[PDB]
Amino acid sequence: MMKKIDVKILDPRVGKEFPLPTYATSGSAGLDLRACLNDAVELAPGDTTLVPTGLAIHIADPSLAAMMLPRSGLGHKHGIVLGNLVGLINSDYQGQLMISVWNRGQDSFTIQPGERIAQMIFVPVVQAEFNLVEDFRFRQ
Amino acid sequence: MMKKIDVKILDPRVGKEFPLPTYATSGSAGLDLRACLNDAVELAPGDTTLVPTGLAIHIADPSLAAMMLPRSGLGHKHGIVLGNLVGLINSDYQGQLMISVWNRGQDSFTIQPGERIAQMIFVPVVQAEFNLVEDFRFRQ
Amino acid sequence: MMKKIDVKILDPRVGKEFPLPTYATSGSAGLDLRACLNDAVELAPGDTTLVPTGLAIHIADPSLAAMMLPRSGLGHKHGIVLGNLVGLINSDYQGQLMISVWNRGQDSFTIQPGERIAQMIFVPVVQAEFNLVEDFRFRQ
Ligand SMILES: O=c1ccn([C@H]2C[C@H](O)[C@@H](COP(=O)(O)NP(=O)(O)OP(=O)(O)O)O2)c(=O)[nH]1
Ligand SMILES: O=c1ccn([C@H]2C[C@H](O)[C@@H](COP(=O)(O)NP(=O)(O)OP(=O)(O)O)O2)c(=O)[nH]1
Ligand SMILES: O=c1ccn([C@H]2C[C@H](O)[C@@H](COP(=O)(O)NP(=O)(O)OP(=O)(O)O)O2)c(=O)[nH]1
Ligand SMILES: [Mg+2]
Ligand SMILES: [Mg+2]
Ligand SMILES: [Mg+2]
């Protein structure tokens, strides 16, 4: 299912030196996000750093949201994941997309400019209206 | 996309002293969940605590689920995330919604009664039926 | 909402000694994935291990993806979660489904053959086409 989403380039390297996010195949669920940095950032074990993307999106449709996730290789092999675990991008958010990068492992890691460091999916969302009722199934 | 969801208030402070979850804007994807606690809980670095919400929902429609996520500020700045990372709420679950709060950082944190400590989204889900076949593309 | 999904059994114990993933109730959102192991794996605090499932799926429809999540009990009580936090399975992926199991806690844990160690949901996804525009709201 396809949707055009407005994007504003905030740093002129995005779409040039730092490619815009794209889908690798017709069947990819996520777009890889790249680090928009002037120089490498060394991220020590246990630490968190805020990585800019150099871009803003405006999903606009309240029936859609995005979710930011780690990439599986980085997470599994390097312990490079997100400090907020999973990021939620609201339809009315128009600020820069930021990546909270957390080193959950034991090895120092260099975040390089332009590196595909996380990924983002677009999922339909439903807005709940609560209906209060009196009455209406944590080894494993 | 909108859906009415049945909710049962389990603690009489919910909807009073502890506001019911709400969406901030017409374009918000998630509802913030509040800690239903009698007193603050001090959460040491690395530790996990189970926080009640004082409410139960019944999604009821098997085409919908909810996902509990950290809030980005708390996760990035304070290391206050979920012990199960992301929570999945099944359509037929009718128990109290519980929040596994994990301090993944290095600083002690006080969880206050009524604090917006996590968030929840409602997403469509598909139930898979497996079709066995003989035959039917882990730096980065 | 229901969909038949092609699955290939890669290890002949899957569907026999190691049951195929199933939904517990008509209202369950997720399928539990089992560890396809010859012997138990002892996972020390802080460590990550790659657990095979013995199966491959082919979602095939680019409007669908799967997400792998921790189980709430394991995550909250035992600190047994995913090293990549949340796994994203693309529609065109046809390899073995792998589980990055991370012990985020302080206690050693034994991963047993056949153990339900994670869960997976199928969610609709939308593929974004970016539309560049000049112009188009991080306690808490
Ligand atoms: O937990 C996971 C996550 C992914 N996978 C598989 C399926 C998915 O389609 C594939 C790629 O996932 P990612 O894009 O998150 N990983 P990465 O970007 O490191 O690999 P690639 O370069 O192939 O895209 O790996 C798993 O088996 N388990
Ligand atoms: O990983 C993320 C997560 C969120 N965001 C942006 C977009 C999202 O719409 C916005 C708010 O996300 P949260 O509601 O999770 N954070 P918080 O509740 O701390 O901020 P706010 O008070 O504005 O809602 O922050 C990112 O740029 N990266
Ligand atoms: O963060 C959470 C996650 C789950 N839950 C509730 C709702 C959900 O439907 C239920 C079961 O979730 P899981 O299947 O992830 N946990 P587990 O597999 O350990 O429990 P069960 O054996 O009942 O399925 O627990 C919460 O209250 N908070
Ligand atoms: Mg990838
Ligand atoms: Mg928020
Ligand atoms: Mg379960």
mmCIF file of all heavy atoms in Angstrom, chain C residues 89-125:
data_model
loop_
_atom_site.group_PDB
_atom_site.id
_atom_site.type_symbol
_atom_site.label_atom_id
_atom_site.label_comp_id
_atom_site.label_asym_id
_atom_site.label_seq_id
_atom_site.Cartn_x
_atom_site.Cartn_y
_atom_site.Cartn_z
ATOM 1 N N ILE C 89 10.333 -8.338 9.973
ATOM 2 C CA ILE C 89 10.410 -9.337 8.910
ATOM 3 C C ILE C 89 9.765 -8.774 7.651
ATOM 4 O O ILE C 89 8.568 -8.482 7.655
ATOM 5 C CB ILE C 89 9.695 -10.636 9.308
ATOM 6 C CG1 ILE C 89 10.042 -11.081 10.752
ATOM 7 C CG2 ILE C 89 9.985 -11.709 8.282
ATOM 8 C CD1 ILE C 89 11.496 -11.270 11.049
ATOM 9 N N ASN C 90 10.557 -8.583 6.603
ATOM 10 C CA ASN C 90 10.082 -8.014 5.346
ATOM 11 C C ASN C 90 9.328 -9.035 4.528
ATOM 12 O O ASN C 90 9.579 -10.246 4.611
ATOM 13 C CB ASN C 90 11.295 -7.499 4.529
ATOM 14 C CG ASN C 90 12.028 -6.400 5.252
ATOM 15 O OD1 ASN C 90 11.436 -5.382 5.594
ATOM 16 N ND2 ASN C 90 13.319 -6.604 5.520
ATOM 17 N N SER C 91 8.403 -8.552 3.704
ATOM 18 C CA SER C 91 7.565 -9.438 2.903
ATOM 19 C C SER C 91 8.328 -10.334 1.932
ATOM 20 O O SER C 91 7.835 -11.402 1.573
ATOM 21 C CB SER C 91 6.493 -8.645 2.138
ATOM 22 O OG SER C 91 7.093 -7.812 1.145
ATOM 23 N N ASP C 92 9.483 -9.882 1.478
ATOM 24 C CA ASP C 92 10.264 -10.635 0.511
ATOM 25 C C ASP C 92 11.387 -11.437 1.143
ATOM 26 O O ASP C 92 12.180 -12.040 0.436
ATOM 27 C CB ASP C 92 10.768 -9.734 -0.616
ATOM 28 C CG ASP C 92 11.635 -8.601 -0.155
ATOM 29 O OD1 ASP C 92 11.836 -8.398 1.062
ATOM 30 O OD2 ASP C 92 12.177 -7.837 -0.985
ATOM 31 N N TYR C 93 11.439 -11.474 2.476
ATOM 32 C CA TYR C 93 12.448 -12.297 3.140
ATOM 33 C C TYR C 93 12.028 -13.766 3.109
ATOM 34 O O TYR C 93 10.906 -14.101 3.496
ATOM 35 C CB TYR C 93 12.587 -11.876 4.591
ATOM 36 C CG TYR C 93 13.631 -12.659 5.352
ATOM 37 C CD1 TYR C 93 14.985 -12.458 5.115
ATOM 38 C CD2 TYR C 93 13.263 -13.568 6.360
ATOM 39 C CE1 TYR C 93 15.961 -13.162 5.846
ATOM 40 C CE2 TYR C 93 14.251 -14.279 7.071
ATOM 41 C CZ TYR C 93 15.572 -14.061 6.822
ATOM 42 O OH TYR C 93 16.523 -14.766 7.535
ATOM 43 N N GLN C 94 12.943 -14.643 2.709
ATOM 44 C CA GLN C 94 12.658 -16.058 2.585
ATOM 45 C C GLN C 94 13.673 -16.918 3.358
ATOM 46 O O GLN C 94 13.695 -18.141 3.227
ATOM 47 C CB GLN C 94 12.660 -16.446 1.094
ATOM 48 C CG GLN C 94 11.554 -15.819 0.311
ATOM 49 C CD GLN C 94 11.490 -16.310 -1.154
ATOM 50 O OE1 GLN C 94 12.444 -16.870 -1.678
ATOM 51 N NE2 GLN C 94 10.357 -16.109 -1.780
ATOM 52 N N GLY C 95 14.519 -16.285 4.151
ATOM 53 C CA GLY C 95 15.485 -17.009 4.959
ATOM 54 C C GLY C 95 14.871 -17.552 6.233
ATOM 55 O O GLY C 95 13.712 -17.310 6.546
ATOM 56 N N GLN C 96 15.685 -18.274 6.994
ATOM 57 C CA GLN C 96 15.247 -18.746 8.299
ATOM 58 C C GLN C 96 14.931 -17.574 9.226
ATOM 59 O O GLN C 96 15.677 -16.594 9.270
ATOM 60 C CB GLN C 96 16.344 -19.589 8.940
ATOM 61 C CG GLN C 96 15.893 -20.235 10.224
ATOM 62 C CD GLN C 96 16.870 -21.245 10.818
ATOM 63 O OE1 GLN C 96 16.478 -22.025 11.661
ATOM 64 N NE2 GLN C 96 18.118 -21.214 10.402
ATOM 65 N N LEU C 97 13.844 -17.682 9.978
ATOM 66 C CA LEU C 97 13.539 -16.703 11.016
ATOM 67 C C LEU C 97 14.463 -16.940 12.184
ATOM 68 O O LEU C 97 14.526 -18.055 12.707
ATOM 69 C CB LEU C 97 12.106 -16.821 11.495
ATOM 70 C CG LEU C 97 10.976 -16.458 10.553
ATOM 71 C CD1 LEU C 97 9.642 -16.679 11.278
ATOM 72 C CD2 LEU C 97 11.123 -15.002 10.082
ATOM 73 N N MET C 98 15.213 -15.917 12.560
ATOM 74 C CA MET C 98 16.202 -16.039 13.648
ATOM 75 C C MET C 98 15.772 -15.142 14.798
ATOM 76 O O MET C 98 15.164 -14.097 14.575
ATOM 77 C CB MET C 98 17.568 -15.596 13.139
ATOM 78 C CG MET C 98 18.051 -16.339 11.892
ATOM 79 S SD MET C 98 18.142 -18.129 12.073
ATOM 80 C CE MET C 98 19.514 -18.282 13.216
ATOM 81 N N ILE C 99 16.082 -15.550 16.032
ATOM 82 C CA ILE C 99 15.743 -14.773 17.223
ATOM 83 C C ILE C 99 17.026 -14.362 17.953
ATOM 84 O O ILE C 99 17.813 -15.226 18.397
ATOM 85 C CB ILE C 99 14.853 -15.563 18.181
ATOM 86 C CG1 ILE C 99 13.689 -16.232 17.435
ATOM 87 C CG2 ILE C 99 14.315 -14.632 19.299
ATOM 88 C CD1 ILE C 99 12.912 -17.183 18.312
ATOM 89 N N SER C 100 17.254 -13.064 18.052
ATOM 90 C CA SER C 100 18.386 -12.528 18.792
ATOM 91 C C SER C 100 17.935 -12.415 20.230
ATOM 92 O O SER C 100 17.160 -11.510 20.559
ATOM 93 C CB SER C 100 18.818 -11.157 18.251
ATOM 94 O OG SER C 100 19.758 -10.540 19.105
ATOM 95 N N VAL C 101 18.379 -13.338 21.081
ATOM 96 C CA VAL C 101 17.929 -13.373 22.474
ATOM 97 C C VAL C 101 18.994 -12.689 23.337
ATOM 98 O O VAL C 101 20.171 -13.048 23.294
ATOM 99 C CB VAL C 101 17.642 -14.800 22.980
ATOM 100 C CG1 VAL C 101 17.197 -14.774 24.449
ATOM 101 C CG2 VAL C 101 16.612 -15.501 22.118
ATOM 102 N N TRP C 102 18.568 -11.693 24.093
ATOM 103 C CA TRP C 102 19.441 -10.884 24.929
ATOM 104 C C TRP C 102 18.952 -10.960 26.352
ATOM 105 O O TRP C 102 17.764 -10.762 26.645
ATOM 106 C CB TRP C 102 19.463 -9.438 24.424
ATOM 107 C CG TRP C 102 20.183 -8.444 25.315
ATOM 108 C CD1 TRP C 102 21.365 -8.627 25.989
ATOM 109 C CD2 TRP C 102 19.748 -7.124 25.620
ATOM 110 N NE1 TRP C 102 21.690 -7.486 26.686
ATOM 111 C CE2 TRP C 102 20.699 -6.556 26.499
ATOM 112 C CE3 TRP C 102 18.639 -6.354 25.239
ATOM 113 C CZ2 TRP C 102 20.581 -5.273 26.986
ATOM 114 C CZ3 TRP C 102 18.519 -5.085 25.726
ATOM 115 C CH2 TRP C 102 19.494 -4.553 26.594
ATOM 116 N N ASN C 103 19.883 -11.291 27.248
ATOM 117 C CA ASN C 103 19.657 -11.251 28.675
ATOM 118 C C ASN C 103 20.014 -9.872 29.212
ATOM 119 O O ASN C 103 21.165 -9.571 29.445
ATOM 120 C CB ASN C 103 20.497 -12.328 29.364
ATOM 121 C CG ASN C 103 20.127 -12.517 30.824
ATOM 122 O OD1 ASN C 103 19.450 -11.680 31.425
ATOM 123 N ND2 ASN C 103 20.568 -13.649 31.409
ATOM 124 N N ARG C 104 19.006 -9.042 29.409
ATOM 125 C CA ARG C 104 19.202 -7.666 29.861
ATOM 126 C C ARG C 104 19.246 -7.554 31.384
ATOM 127 O O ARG C 104 19.359 -6.450 31.919
ATOM 128 C CB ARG C 104 18.093 -6.754 29.346
ATOM 129 C CG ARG C 104 16.735 -7.028 29.983
ATOM 130 C CD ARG C 104 15.713 -5.909 29.852
ATOM 131 N NE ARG C 104 14.555 -6.204 30.692
ATOM 132 C CZ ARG C 104 14.533 -6.068 32.024
ATOM 133 N NH1 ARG C 104 15.600 -5.597 32.681
ATOM 134 N NH2 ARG C 104 13.446 -6.408 32.705
ATOM 135 N N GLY C 105 19.090 -8.677 32.057
ATOM 136 C CA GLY C 105 19.015 -8.698 33.508
ATOM 137 C C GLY C 105 20.319 -9.135 34.159
ATOM 138 O O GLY C 105 21.394 -9.137 33.552
ATOM 139 N N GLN C 106 20.189 -9.528 35.420
ATOM 140 C CA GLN C 106 21.325 -9.829 36.277
ATOM 141 C C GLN C 106 21.437 -11.321 36.598
ATOM 142 O O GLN C 106 22.380 -11.749 37.259
ATOM 143 C CB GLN C 106 21.200 -9.009 37.562
ATOM 144 C CG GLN C 106 21.458 -7.508 37.363
ATOM 145 C CD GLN C 106 20.250 -6.747 36.790
ATOM 146 O OE1 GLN C 106 20.374 -6.030 35.787
ATOM 147 N NE2 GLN C 106 19.089 -6.902 37.425
ATOM 148 N N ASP C 107 20.497 -12.119 36.105
ATOM 149 C CA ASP C 107 20.482 -13.545 36.391
ATOM 150 C C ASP C 107 20.708 -14.382 35.136
ATOM 151 O O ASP C 107 20.078 -14.152 34.105
ATOM 152 C CB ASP C 107 19.145 -13.920 37.023
ATOM 153 C CG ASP C 107 18.924 -13.238 38.361
ATOM 154 O OD1 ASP C 107 19.797 -13.204 39.257
ATOM 155 O OD2 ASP C 107 17.829 -12.673 38.562
ATOM 156 N N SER C 108 21.591 -15.368 35.235
ATOM 157 C CA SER C 108 21.773 -16.347 34.168
ATOM 158 C C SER C 108 20.455 -17.050 33.875
ATOM 159 O O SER C 108 19.627 -17.232 34.769
ATOM 160 C CB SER C 108 22.843 -17.378 34.534
ATOM 161 O OG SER C 108 23.206 -18.145 33.400
ATOM 162 N N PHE C 109 20.256 -17.415 32.606
ATOM 163 C CA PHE C 109 19.009 -17.997 32.139
ATOM 164 C C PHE C 109 19.306 -19.119 31.186
ATOM 165 O O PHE C 109 20.166 -18.986 30.317
ATOM 166 C CB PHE C 109 18.172 -16.929 31.397
ATOM 167 C CG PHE C 109 16.815 -17.414 30.956
ATOM 168 C CD1 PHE C 109 15.729 -17.366 31.816
ATOM 169 C CD2 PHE C 109 16.616 -17.880 29.657
ATOM 170 C CE1 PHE C 109 14.469 -17.800 31.415
ATOM 171 C CE2 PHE C 109 15.370 -18.319 29.255
ATOM 172 C CZ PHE C 109 14.290 -18.271 30.145
ATOM 173 N N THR C 110 18.582 -20.226 31.325
ATOM 174 C CA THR C 110 18.717 -21.361 30.434
ATOM 175 C C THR C 110 17.637 -21.340 29.362
ATOM 176 O O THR C 110 16.455 -21.452 29.674
ATOM 177 C CB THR C 110 18.591 -22.645 31.239
ATOM 178 O OG1 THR C 110 19.510 -22.579 32.337
ATOM 179 C CG2 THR C 110 19.010 -23.852 30.419
ATOM 180 N N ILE C 111 18.067 -21.209 28.108
ATOM 181 C CA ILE C 111 17.161 -21.311 26.968
ATOM 182 C C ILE C 111 17.050 -22.794 26.602
ATOM 183 O O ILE C 111 18.021 -23.425 26.197
ATOM 184 C CB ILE C 111 17.673 -20.533 25.760
ATOM 185 C CG1 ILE C 111 18.004 -19.078 26.146
ATOM 186 C CG2 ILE C 111 16.613 -20.558 24.646
ATOM 187 C CD1 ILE C 111 18.691 -18.323 25.045
ATOM 188 N N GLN C 112 15.861 -23.329 26.751
ATOM 189 C CA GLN C 112 15.622 -24.728 26.496
ATOM 190 C C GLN C 112 15.119 -24.971 25.091
ATOM 191 O O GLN C 112 14.349 -24.175 24.566
ATOM 192 C CB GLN C 112 14.604 -25.230 27.472
ATOM 193 C CG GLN C 112 15.099 -25.128 28.913
ATOM 194 C CD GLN C 112 15.956 -26.299 29.332
ATOM 195 O OE1 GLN C 112 16.495 -27.038 28.489
ATOM 196 N NE2 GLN C 112 16.076 -26.491 30.641
ATOM 197 N N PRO C 113 15.504 -26.092 24.492
ATOM 198 C CA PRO C 113 14.912 -26.489 23.229
ATOM 199 C C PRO C 113 13.401 -26.528 23.357
ATOM 200 O O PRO C 113 12.851 -26.995 24.336
ATOM 201 C CB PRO C 113 15.499 -27.880 22.991
ATOM 202 C CG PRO C 113 16.774 -27.864 23.748
ATOM 203 C CD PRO C 113 16.514 -27.073 24.953
ATOM 204 N N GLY C 114 12.730 -25.978 22.352
ATOM 205 C CA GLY C 114 11.290 -26.005 22.277
ATOM 206 C C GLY C 114 10.596 -24.899 23.075
ATOM 207 O O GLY C 114 9.405 -24.764 22.952
ATOM 208 N N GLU C 115 11.346 -24.108 23.850
ATOM 209 C CA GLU C 115 10.785 -23.083 24.722
ATOM 210 C C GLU C 115 10.191 -21.971 23.859
ATOM 211 O O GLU C 115 10.838 -21.535 22.905
ATOM 212 C CB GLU C 115 11.893 -22.488 25.600
ATOM 213 C CG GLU C 115 11.430 -21.434 26.592
ATOM 214 C CD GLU C 115 12.430 -21.097 27.707
ATOM 215 O OE1 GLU C 115 13.627 -21.510 27.693
ATOM 216 O OE2 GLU C 115 11.992 -20.386 28.636
ATOM 217 N N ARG C 116 8.987 -21.528 24.225
ATOM 218 C CA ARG C 116 8.368 -20.325 23.630
ATOM 219 C C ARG C 116 9.131 -19.126 24.169
ATOM 220 O O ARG C 116 8.977 -18.785 25.347
ATOM 221 C CB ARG C 116 6.865 -20.270 23.955
ATOM 222 C CG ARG C 116 6.092 -21.342 23.157
ATOM 223 C CD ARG C 116 4.662 -21.519 23.501
ATOM 224 N NE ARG C 116 4.505 -22.156 24.805
ATOM 225 C CZ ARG C 116 4.136 -21.530 25.915
ATOM 226 N NH1 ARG C 116 3.861 -20.239 25.897
ATOM 227 N NH2 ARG C 116 4.029 -22.207 27.055
ATOM 228 N N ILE C 117 9.989 -18.531 23.341
ATOM 229 C CA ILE C 117 10.980 -17.538 23.801
ATOM 230 C C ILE C 117 10.719 -16.113 23.295
ATOM 231 O O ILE C 117 11.300 -15.142 23.811
ATOM 232 C CB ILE C 117 12.408 -18.018 23.434
ATOM 233 C CG1 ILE C 117 13.465 -17.346 24.303
ATOM 234 C CG2 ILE C 117 12.712 -17.810 21.943
ATOM 235 C CD1 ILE C 117 13.483 -17.856 25.708
ATOM 236 N N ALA C 118 9.854 -16.002 22.301
ATOM 237 C CA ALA C 118 9.487 -14.702 21.709
ATOM 238 C C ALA C 118 8.134 -14.863 21.039
ATOM 239 O O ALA C 118 7.561 -15.952 21.035
ATOM 240 C CB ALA C 118 10.507 -14.267 20.708
ATOM 241 N N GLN C 119 7.629 -13.785 20.457
ATOM 242 C CA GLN C 119 6.354 -13.814 19.766
ATOM 243 C C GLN C 119 6.407 -12.927 18.528
ATOM 244 O O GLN C 119 7.258 -12.063 18.409
ATOM 245 C CB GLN C 119 5.203 -13.411 20.676
ATOM 246 C CG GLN C 119 5.231 -11.990 21.164
ATOM 247 C CD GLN C 119 4.189 -11.730 22.207
ATOM 248 O OE1 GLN C 119 3.078 -12.275 22.116
ATOM 249 N NE2 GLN C 119 4.524 -10.914 23.214
ATOM 250 N N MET C 120 5.489 -13.156 17.603
ATOM 251 C CA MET C 120 5.487 -12.448 16.340
ATOM 252 C C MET C 120 4.070 -12.040 15.959
ATOM 253 O O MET C 120 3.135 -12.853 16.074
ATOM 254 C CB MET C 120 6.074 -13.346 15.255
ATOM 255 C CG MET C 120 6.302 -12.680 13.960
ATOM 256 S SD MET C 120 7.294 -13.783 12.838
ATOM 257 C CE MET C 120 6.430 -14.924 12.805
ATOM 258 N N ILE C 121 3.915 -10.787 15.526
ATOM 259 C CA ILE C 121 2.660 -10.260 15.022
ATOM 260 C C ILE C 121 2.796 -9.898 13.532
ATOM 261 O O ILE C 121 3.898 -9.627 13.052
ATOM 262 C CB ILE C 121 2.184 -9.033 15.807
ATOM 263 C CG1 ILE C 121 3.159 -7.859 15.679
ATOM 264 C CG2 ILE C 121 2.008 -9.417 17.265
ATOM 265 C CD1 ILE C 121 2.663 -6.584 16.283
ATOM 266 N N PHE C 122 1.679 -9.950 12.815
ATOM 267 C CA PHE C 122 1.613 -9.516 11.430
ATOM 268 C C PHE C 122 0.803 -8.217 11.385
ATOM 269 O O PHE C 122 -0.312 -8.179 11.900
ATOM 270 C CB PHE C 122 0.964 -10.602 10.545
ATOM 271 C CG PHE C 122 1.801 -11.818 10.427
ATOM 272 C CD1 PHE C 122 1.713 -12.816 11.383
ATOM 273 C CD2 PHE C 122 2.753 -11.935 9.429
ATOM 274 C CE1 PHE C 122 2.525 -13.956 11.317
ATOM 275 C CE2 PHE C 122 3.578 -13.091 9.367
ATOM 276 C CZ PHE C 122 3.462 -14.076 10.315
ATOM 277 N N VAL C 123 1.398 -7.163 10.833
ATOM 278 C CA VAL C 123 0.783 -5.840 10.770
ATOM 279 C C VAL C 123 0.827 -5.336 9.351
ATOM 280 O O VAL C 123 1.810 -5.529 8.621
ATOM 281 C CB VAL C 123 1.477 -4.807 11.702
ATOM 282 C CG1 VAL C 123 1.313 -5.199 13.174
ATOM 283 C CG2 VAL C 123 2.947 -4.592 11.314
ATOM 284 N N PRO C 124 -0.227 -4.684 8.909
ATOM 285 C CA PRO C 124 -0.153 -3.956 7.651
ATOM 286 C C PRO C 124 0.909 -2.874 7.686
ATOM 287 O O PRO C 124 1.138 -2.231 8.725
ATOM 288 C CB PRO C 124 -1.530 -3.312 7.530
ATOM 289 C CG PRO C 124 -2.388 -4.030 8.446
ATOM 290 C CD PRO C 124 -1.540 -4.524 9.561
ATOM 291 N N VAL C 125 1.582 -2.692 6.556
ATOM 292 C CA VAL C 125 2.566 -1.624 6.425
ATOM 293 C C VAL C 125 2.282 -0.831 5.166
ATOM 294 O O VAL C 125 1.734 -1.340 4.190
ATOM 295 C CB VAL C 125 4.018 -2.146 6.444
ATOM 296 C CG1 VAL C 125 4.343 -2.715 7.842
ATOM 297 C CG2 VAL C 125 4.268 -3.166 5.306
#
